[PDB]
Structures are given as C-alpha cells and as structure tokens.
Design a protein around this ligand. Structure first.
Ligand SMILES: [Cl-]
Ligand SMILES: [Cl-]
Ligand SMILES: [Cl-]
Ligand SMILES: [Cl-]
Ligand SMILES: [Cl-]
Ligand SMILES: [Cl-]
Ligand SMILES: [Cl-]
Ligand SMILES: [Cl-]
Ligand SMILES: [Cl-]
Ligand SMILES: [Cl-]
Ligand SMILES: [Mg+2]
Ligand SMILES: [Mg+2]
Ligand SMILES: [Mg+2]
Ligand SMILES: [Mg+2]
Lengths: 399, 399, 399, 399
C-alpha cells in the first residue's frame, strides 16, 4: 500500500429539488475521487467559504490514507472548533476520504468497518396533516408503501399572529400556541390508535416546541399510546430537565439532531437520559467521530437513529445506511424520498423497499456526483421563515 | 423614544498589524452608526460570508432598539446554532447594536448596564523568553510599565521534530515534549519567586498542552509558588477532570477562551471547578450573552477574566473594559499593546496606565472605524502552523 | 456624561386605598427626580426609619450614575444584611436610581436593559368565592375582561375556631382545616374544567397552608386538571421537600414571593425544583439584584412570575412590567386592579388590556408621585389578623 | 400555675461606652419584669420602631408563660420574616419572656433548660496589633489575665487608598489588599508559635476578607500552626466553597455570626462543613430558636461558639453564658470586657475568671436594666466607615 496524495478539494452547492445541498469532492493524484456531505442547508455559502478558502490549501499534498490523523488535525486547525459550519466542512472531507478508502479496498464502506450486524435497517418516513382526515391519508399512503414505522404530526404550527390571541402590533414571525400543539398531539395519538391499532410503530417529533414542565406533561400524556419514540422533547440547553421527564414517564426519548459539540451529548448518554441518539452525521464532523459516538452510545445501551432529512445529500443518506448496516446498536433510518432530479445529480443512493434499507454493494459510499447536472441547479437564497418561531406573546422560542 | 431602523450591515476584514481582524458596521436610517467585533482570526472570510450573505438580508429594516429580541432571533435563525463562526457573526451585530444604544442614550456602554463597580480594572500582559535571562528582561520591562500582574512563559514549544527524540519519517507539524514543558514551567516559577519575591502576581497559560494526570501533577507542583491563576490546564473536552485537579491542589484555575457553546461552561461553573472564566466575548455571541454569563458566574462566586489577545479589534478591547468596569465579579483584563496603525484604524480604545484600565468616557463603545485606512490593510492568508501541534510520537494534541 | 449628585432621599407612607404603601424619592442636584418602591405593607414605619435615619445620611452627595457600586455598598453597609426591611429600604433607592438613569438616557427602563423580548406580557388576576356559584361569577367577570389566565380559590380559610372541631378554650387566631382546604381545592379544579373546558389557564395559590406530605398529595390530586401553576406549595424552610413533589407529579410549581435572602433560592433553582420564580422585586433588594436572579433562572430554564399584589406601589407594578418586557424568560404578570385614588397618587402605571400588559413608553419607570395627594392619605395601623394562622388543634402554621 | 399577663413592652437604646445597645423590657400584670437583647448596633432606631410600633400592640394582654406559641406567632406575624431587624425585635421579647419564666421558677435560666453539662465554659478574648511587638504586648496582657484561648490579628486593614497602589480618583471607603492580609496572617501564626509555643489556643477571624480560592489557600497555609479555629473564612453566600476548603485542609472552621435566616446554616451543618457555629443569638430570633439550632448542631457533631462582641448588651452576654453552661456541645465563649458604666446600666452579667465563665446563680437571666442611668447615655449616630470595604481596584467587598 502506497500514499494516496490529495490533489484538490472542491465544494459545490446544488439545489435539484427543495433544499440547498453541499457536496465536497476530494480528488487524488492516483485518480481516485471521493465525495462527502457538508450540508448545512441554512448557511451553505459559508460552508463553501470554509472548504475553498481554508481546507483546500491546508489539505492538498497530504496522504489521504490516514483519515484519523487528518480528522484530528483538521478538527483543531482553527484552534477554536466544533459548531455547525466548522463540523460540516470537515465532514465533507472526512466522508470523501472514507469513500476513497472504500474504493481502494474494493469494499463497500460498511464492510471496512467490519461488515453487517443485520440484514437490513428498518426505515421510517414522515406523515402529516392539518386535519385527521389529511393525516390519515398521509399515513395510509406510507402503509401502502410497506412502512411499519411512521412519524406523525397533526396540525401545523407557525403562521400569522392574527390566528391566535396575540398582542396589538405583533412582531413578524411564525406564531404558535404550545397548548394547542400539546392537546392536538395527544388527540392525534388517541385517534391513530383507534384507527390503526397497536402494532404500527408511531413516532412523533416535538421539535423543541415546549418549556420543561410542558415536556414532562406531554411525555406522561402520550405514554398510554406507546410511541416508538418522542423526539426533541426539550432543546439542547434544557437537556438536564430530561431527568424529570424520566421520573414521570417511560416513553422512549430521542434527541440530538441539533448537536455539534460533544459537550451536548456526553452527560445525556452517561446518565441514560435518552434511548435513541439523533445526530446529523455531518453536524458532528463526519464518519470518524460518528463511529466513536456510536460506540460510546453502545456502552450505555443507547441506540442509533441518525438524522435523515431532505436537507442532506444522497451521499449523506448512503453514509447513514453504511453506519446503520454495520453498527450493532443502530435502530432505524429516518428516510425522505428523493426526486428524479436529485437521483440524477447523485446516482447510487439507497432506496427503501417495504420499510427496509438494504446493504449497499458498490465500493466506498456508492454515490456519484454529476457536476455538469449540478450546474443546472445552482444555489437559491431562501428565508426559512419557520426559524423565527414566536409564542402567543411574541417571544422567540427555539424553533 | 422612536424606532431606530437598521439601514445596512457590513463586514470588513483588516490587518493593520499581525492579525486578521473582523468588524461589523451597522448603519441606521437615523444616521447612528455602531461597530462590533466579529474577530475569529483563523477563519475571517467565513465570518464575512455569514454577515454579508445571511445576517444582512435578515436584519435590514428591523428596529435596532430591541437588542434582546434580535439577539434571540439571530441566535436560532439557522436552526443549528452556537459555534465559533455563528457566534462571531452575531457578536458583530450585537455589539454594534449596544454601541447604537449608548450613543442614543448619550452614555458610555458600561453606564447603560448600571454604571461602575470599581474605579479601574487591573490589567495583565504577556512576558516570555526562551531562557530565564530573556524572560527576566521581558518581565522587567512590564514591571517598569507599572504592571503588577504578569503572565509568564519560559521556553517555546512547537518546532521541528529533529529537536526531540522523534520517530523516523516524522509528519510535519509543531512538535513538542510535555515533560520538557512541565519541568521548565516549574523551574520558571521557582526562579521568578527567587528573583522578584512574593508580591508580584504571576499568571501562567498551560494552553491545553497536557493530558489529565499531567494537569493534576503540574497543578500540585506549581502550588508552592502561589500563581494568580493557571489557565487552560485541560482542553474543554476533558474539563470533568478538573474535579481531580481540585482534589489535589488549591491553585487558582482559569478556563474558557475556547468556549462557544453553553454546554461547555454550565457544569464547570455549577460545580465550582474554576475560579476565573476566560471567555472571548465574540466567541459566545457578544455583550447580550456575556452579561447573562457574568451573572451566572456571580451566583457561584466565579470571577471574570475575559480573553483579550491581539487577535481582537480594539472595539473588542473596549467592550471587555465596559464589562469589566460594570460587572461586580470582574477580576482582571488581559491586555496586549496595539500598534499606531491599529489605533489609527480603530481610534478611541482604552489604554493601560500603571497596571489599570479606566472607565471609558465617550457614549457607546467609544471606538471608531477608519474605513479608508482599513481598506489600505487587507486580509492576508496565514498558515497558523502552531495549530498543528504534535507530541513526540507524532500525535495531534489540542493546540 | 457628568456626575449626577444625590441631593436628598425621602420616604413616604401612603394609603390611598386598602394597603399601606411605601415610596422612596431620590432628588438630585441636577433636578432629576427618581421614585422607587419599598413596600413591606406589614411593617412600613420601620422601612421609613431605615430610609430616613440611615440611607439618607449615607447616600447624600454620592454619584447616582453608579447604581452597581451603590447597590453593592448599601447591601453590606450595616454588616448584617438581607431580610425584608433591609432589602425594601435598598430597593426604594435602587429603583429610584434606575428611574433617574432612564430619564437621563431618554429611554423607558426596559430599553436600558437592552429592549423588548416580547410584544406584551400575559397577565393574570385573582378570582375567589366561598361557593362555586360565587367563584364562577368572579371567573366570568375576568373572562369578560379578556383574561386567559385566572388564579382561582374556592372557600375562605381562617376564621373562628368554633367553626371547626377545636379544643376547649381555643387561642385567638385565624383557624382553618388543611383537609377541608385540600378537598375543596380538588373539587374546585374539577368543577372549573367541567364548566370552562381545557383552554383556560387556571392558577392556584396554596399559600404555604400544608405540611410536606400534604403538598405531595395535593400536587398529585391536581395533576389531571392541568394547572398553569401551583404556587407556594411549601413554606421556604421546607423547600427541600420539593424533591418529593417532583418525584410524584408533573404540575408546574411556582415559589418565592416570601424570599429575601439568596440562600432561599440558590439550591431550589440549581436543582430545577421550580418552574416559575415568584419573588417580590422590593423584597430581594430592587432591580439590580432582580436582573442577576432573572439571568440565574434563565441558565436553568426557570421562568419569571414576579409577585404583583395590591400591597405594592404602582411604581412596583411598572418595574415588574419593564422587567417582564425585557427578560426573555419572563412568563406572566400577576395583576391586581387599582382604584382611581391609587392612580391619582402614582400616575402613569401600566394597565392590562385583554390579558396583556404592553411596553411602557415614557423615559425611566414612567410613574410619578403626587406628594400632596399622598399626604392626604396617611398610614393607618392594621392588625393583619390572617397572619395568626392556626390549625384545628391551635398550632401556628406558616400563614 | 396561672397566666402571666403582658402589661407593656418597651425598647431602649443606650450607649454607655462605644456601641449603641438595644434592650427590650417586658412588664407583666403580676409585676415580674423581664429584659432581653435586641442589639443590631448598626440599625438600632429601626429595631426600636419594630418593638414600639408593632410588637407592643401585638403582644399586650397575652400569656407570657407560653414562650413557644408566642415565638412561633411573632416569627410569622408580618408574613415576610427572618432578617437582622425582624429577628432582633423578636429576640428582645423572647429573651425577656425566658427571663420571666426563670424568675417565676426561682431558677437560673440554664437550670430551666435542664441544668449544667460542664463546671464552667472556657472563654477567649481579642488580641491585636499593627506590628508584632504591639500584638505580643496584647497577647501578653490576656495571658496575664489567665486566658488560654486568644484570638489574634496582625495588622489593620481598611484605610486610605493612597496607602496602596490604587487607581486615580479613588472612591472613598476602607481600602485594603487581600494579599497583604494573607501573608501577614501566615507570618503572625509562625511568629506566635515561635514566641509562645504550642499549648496556647490561637484563634483567627478572617472576617470574610477573601475570595473562595484565597480562603482555600489560606486554610492550607495556616494548617501547620494548629489554630483553634479559623473564623468566617468565606462570606455566607459563598459557603458552598467550604467543600473545597475541607478537601485541602484540616483547620477547624467557624462560621455564622452573620446568619439571620435558617437557609444560611442548614446545608452547612448537614454536610459537616463547619466545626463551630458562630451565630449571634439575637440575630437568629433569641433563646427559643438558639436551643433548636444547638440541638441540630449536636446531631451532626458541630460545636457552639456563639458571637459575643462588644455590640451586645450584658443581657446578651448572660444569655450566651446560660446556653454555654447547659448545652453539651458548647465549646467556648467569646468575651469582651465591659466598662464600669456598662456594668452600672446592666448589673449582674458574668465575668471571666482565669479563662472561665461560671454558672450564673440568680433566677432568670440575672441582669438588670437601670433605666434612669440608661437616660444619661442616649443613642449616638455613628458612620461605621469600616463597612465600606474596598479592594485595591476599588471594588466593594463583604466587610
Ligand atoms: Cl460554526
Ligand atoms: Cl398554534
Ligand atoms: Cl448500560
Ligand atoms: Cl457560591
Ligand atoms: Cl495600547
Ligand atoms: Cl436547564
Ligand atoms: Cl389598573
Ligand atoms: Cl430585616
Ligand atoms: Cl492592606
Ligand atoms: Cl455526626
Ligand atoms: Mg427532528
Ligand atoms: Mg490563553
Ligand atoms: Mg402568592
Ligand atoms: Mg467574627
């Protein structure tokens, strides 16, 4: 085995469908090309600045074989470290180097890690509706596709202040009522169990909409309906309050899509305050740290449910899958279907078949990047008005 | 009082001396201009991308008076949040908004907060030398300047691997030996006490050079010499080990210049694991969060020593001072002297006089920004080779 | 900005309605007058003695700009410190000094702090009745006024011992039966949910009527009815028992109107034993310490519901509002309507409009003091017989 | 036994020597008169306001026999409670009622409690000097009087800012240097042991002069010299830091003269963070609560050293003595000698004989109050400039 020398590092932003996606391409003197995900959809241009202006000049000429040293070196390179942007930039490169290693080995990524610990990972997808009739139709469509796990939301939260009892001269934002959200959610589970029975796995994402006592209360109220998990019941800065949620309820708890600093997960895992970890692999710095995190989780009996939104390249989807097929403590793959155009730009990403995602068969990650087609779909500025989440008195809440 | 409407938000990178500095300028329809610090010296272009491409379009047209709502809104605006880039971008705007409020009030910033807690804040600066003779000359100069607090380092750490017993074919980086660093530091404190006696306040920055047991050992070894503080004895990710340092030594402990996420400081403050907090105000999101942090520290008897390196605009220096004059638990201001050119680009920043920094007298922050002189001193790419810190076997260490 | 020199400090006791109110007036050589609340209704003459005999001679001639130094100095000035009288005296002066700073800045108080966090603060008020019919009429009136949050009490507790099974020769006092109080309160919540449904926010003040196990039991019994909070479930000296309440119930818990020493709140906040803090701002030493407390609460996810009874000047009402508009973690403003005469003596205080209190617009606190009308309504001695609270065997209980 | 009916309650302020002393006289219809201490020397007129305007009208006509009910009733009577003033007012009355009970029983107070648990209590007094020669003379005089326990201070702390390296335009106050205080104290113990040897019991009062790490450091530095106790090493609000002091040093710790709220002592005692409790009996509400506190202390092996300054009536001195002769866990009586005039106003108080204070022999407290002579010595306003304690940068410190 000889040094595999990094020739260039490029970053592309492409919007084939709804989201600005960020891809890193690492090329080598040997002609082996790797691709990675660096998608932070809300701040893509800054991710590109980091790759083009900093990581490129740092990395060219180095030996790609040594992913571990390179990860450790990149991680501390700006002295100050961690955070959504820093971690996403590194992730793109880290994933791309693992892709290269897979190709050089002639093995799918998960086979490098040590191979399968299951025949396929279960998947869930998203169901929603403003009314029960609409929600039911959404659930019915996913059941017809063969999903056994479905994440369900009733109602939509965050519109005009005039839709509730707001103050005079309200500040613009996405306004909602936590009480309405809570009671609608409880009613939703009850109606879902009445219609669909007790075998369907029902997930629900609270999406940090609540104050600590509200989370405690909601957890107790949803317990009779046996959710598969209740996700992001609290924002990361209030995670100590999970101790009280645990004192009051046995609902499975999932948390962590927002994490981008190890200080956020350490005490959570060590005190067994969650059942499933939800980290976005690119937010935590890529495959290298995800493997260590998965093992830390295993030692405390915590299971894996990595974040798999539409705001992620199919490269990222594929990486979740490799991790899910290999790691013994993996539980479930959140999965959002992709457009034809998205598949054309990034060919080769896993698909769900009757609620399961199977082991990938190509060497490395197994997802390409059609640069020419990526040009046809440039970055578009989006306001993301939902992040300006306001309570009924106009208070900003964690969105 | 009437709404003060944001007209524009600009970001400038300027290098009047050694460091790439980043400054945010907020202009208003009313013609009141504010300036803030967003200096993350190792990644300035990315900070600029964030301000120009994201915060500018978000913020134009909003009422500048409501700093608290705007801080809360900006903080969660990209959903993912915290981290060095995101926080520095918001800092720039937050500081500029406080600058505007002081001007509108006709009061120095610290008078807005509720006015003075002290007549002047003590200051320290940096002394170093590769030999004791060199260190002594450097210390003598600062004593002649009237400093009563001096941060001292003996030797320099991070050069060619051929200076150590390194392996064959060593990887490039800044190589050092922890054992050499430790014994030189112990020798240094002994020699400084022999030469200068026991009234001089002597500070020392470990700069995360050590593994946990080494930190414990060094703290015990330095105890007899009564340091004013021992700073960054452990990297953020090993801060739990401060429990062991506390069990073994009464040395004062300072930590936190690296912080950019509240999960890094919460448990350390609550468990009284530090005596001084060292946060870089722009790294934690500006004045707004620094006030709340200062008050959280107060409730636990923790004192303040905000980061004040050369890699910070004089705007940042001034803000440290305002905070230091007001906050009852402020302890000391790290101070690094500035060149004529730096002062010309950012006129009005505080100066140290016989070891003290005095209350500013102008309204707002009291620091301007000479745009034309700034444009004459553009950004320069720097490799920052010291961040590639390697131990005697080649291992990356936290730099 | 120039020194603003304290010319005099005066204290007035006035009873425009039902309660003895205490107000501090700070006059300056510059002619800017500030007013503060020092209302401890049960001991007003002693507050006046403190201000007239001690704080006046201490304070005359000092620079009013430096609120922080003056607060710290006054706080420790008698060596012994804290407690209801000492803190109310200092509050009066502290608030008046903040009033002065707002006027000097030309800004409403909350704008000094950094401006708005919300468009308006929600408000609640008090409903009561000895029968359900009476309670319902009282609740209906507040709902017609636009309140969405109502604090409800069924029955009255504390009368002649002959109404209970009391011992022969009972000692005079306000006698009550905890079992009667508990069962009536449970009955009340059930009846209110049957009548008004599940959107109405219903608050209930236990007012330290119970022993520890009774508090635990009542919290569990009230859980199904989803109270907005249950307040003062335990007296300050038994607050450790909140650990047991938490183990047994998810009801929201409010505490702290009785606090006047930081040792009362520290452990309760740090251990997340409350959801809302209820401190009377003047009882904790004024605006200066209330800001630090609000921020300490914030770090632990505790929300604010400052005490707002009729025994507080409208100056105090206004200060609650300024704090409530600014502080991000403020939740609700307890509001009691004021007579024409009260408004005439203290003009400018906030009014509730359809369940909201809005940002004040005048500089400073925005509340004046009609001295001549104040002198027309002098102090009246009151026995406050309810503070002599006795159980069915004659035992004094915390009232 | 028949009801003993309270006829009047009076309060006198008298200054026979250096301090404003406060005495409460309770007269009865039966003609048995009791006296109590309510001395809060820094705020005497407010104590008198409380007694004359509030406790007098509350208490007349009640049965004095029932001290426990009356204590409990007075304690909660203003709803808000605890604090130096409230507690001192109640103490005066409480002590006076115990005095009456003693007289009615024909027994010295300590005999009511259950009699002696020692033949005499050891005493200490205060030695001081600016220089060692002066300190030694002071110690020599106390040794010649037969003291075996002596509280020693070297140097005086708190004078003009020009005596140290203070900032320009220093704020008036009592300025000192914690470093100077610390090193002088260490030198003092060393020199005391060299001169006097190792049998003399040496006490030292830190008087909350230090920051937490300074306390930890000083505790370690004084350990070799085997102090009898080190008193008030930390202010009450930083008492959690005693955990670190305990981790680092075996010096006996004494704390509590400042206490006037049970929240201040509870966690301290329960976690065995002190060896001696130092409460001022009148600050904690008199004999009734002191007895309960002493028993709480006993269950955790904490010993008693009640505060016995010159700012206490000889009635208070006598009460300390009764408590000290009876309570098994009493350790030592701080004692400051009294002038002829002081003894003439309050005849009958205990004296020290060869380092011991003996059991009192008269019924009740055994100390009278000569009202006519008390007139010859009225209240005098004093500034107490030492409470305005400033550090070298001008910061207020707990005095
Ligand atoms: Cl970042
Ligand atoms: Cl809604
Ligand atoms: Cl486990
Ligand atoms: Cl503390
Ligand atoms: Cl300078
Ligand atoms: Cl929290
Ligand atoms: Cl009103
Ligand atoms: Cl008091
Ligand atoms: Cl001194
Ligand atoms: Cl024990
Ligand atoms: Mg989610
Ligand atoms: Mg440092
Ligand atoms: Mg209440
Ligand atoms: Mg003392």
């Amino acid at each position: 085995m000889t040094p595999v020398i990094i020739k260039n590092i490029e970053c592309f932003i492409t919007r084939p469908d709804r989201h600005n996606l960020v891809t890193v391409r690492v090329t080598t003197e040997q002609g082996i090309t790797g691709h990675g995900c660096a998608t932070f959809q809300q701040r893509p241009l800054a991710v590109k600045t980091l790759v083009d202006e900093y990581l490129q000049p740092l990395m060219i000429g180095r030996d790609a074989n040594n992913i571990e040293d390179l990860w450790q070196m990149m991680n501390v390179n700006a002295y100050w470290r961690n955070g959504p942007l820093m971690n996403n930039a590194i992730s793109g490169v880290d994933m791309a180097l693992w892709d290269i290693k897979g190709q050089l080995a002639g093995m799918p990524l998960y086979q490098l890690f040590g191979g399968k610990s299951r025949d396929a990972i279960p998947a869930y997808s998203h169901a929603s509706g403003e009314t029960l009739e609409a929600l039911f139709a959404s659930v019915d469509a996913l059941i017809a596709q063969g999903y056994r796990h479905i994440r369900c939301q009733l109602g939509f939260y965050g519109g005009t202040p005039s839709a509730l009892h707001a103050p005079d001269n309200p500040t613009p934002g996405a306004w909602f009522d936590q009480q309405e959200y809570m009671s609608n959610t409880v009613e939703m589970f009850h109606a879902l169990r009445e219609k669909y029975g007790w075998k369907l796995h029902i997930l629900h994402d609270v999406h940090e909409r609540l104050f600590p006592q509200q989370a405690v209360q909601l957890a107790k109220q949803l317990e009779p309906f046996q959710p598969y998990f209740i996700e992001d019941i609290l924002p990361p800065q209030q995670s100590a309050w999970l101790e009280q949620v645990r004192q009051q309820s046995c609902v499975p708890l999932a948390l962590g899509e927002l994490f981008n600093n190890p200080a956020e997960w350490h005490d959570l895992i060590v005190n067994r305050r969650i059942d499933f970890i939800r980290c976005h692999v690119s937010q935590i710095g890529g495959i290298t740290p995800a493997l260590k995190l998965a093992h830390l989780c295993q030692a405390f009996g915590v299971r894996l449910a990595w974040h798999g939104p539409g705001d992620m390249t199919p490269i990222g989807v594929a990486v979740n899958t490799h991790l899910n097929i290999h790691l013994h403590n993996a539980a479930i793959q959140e999965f959002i279907p992709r457009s034809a155009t998205t598949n054309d730009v990034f060919p080769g990403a896993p698909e769900v078949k009757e609620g399961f995602v199977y082991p990938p068969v190509q060497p490395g990650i197994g997802v390409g990047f059609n640069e020419a087609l990526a040009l046809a779909h440039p970055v578009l500025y989006r306001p993301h008005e939902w992040t300006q989440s306001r309570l009924p008195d106009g208070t900003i809440h964690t969105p």
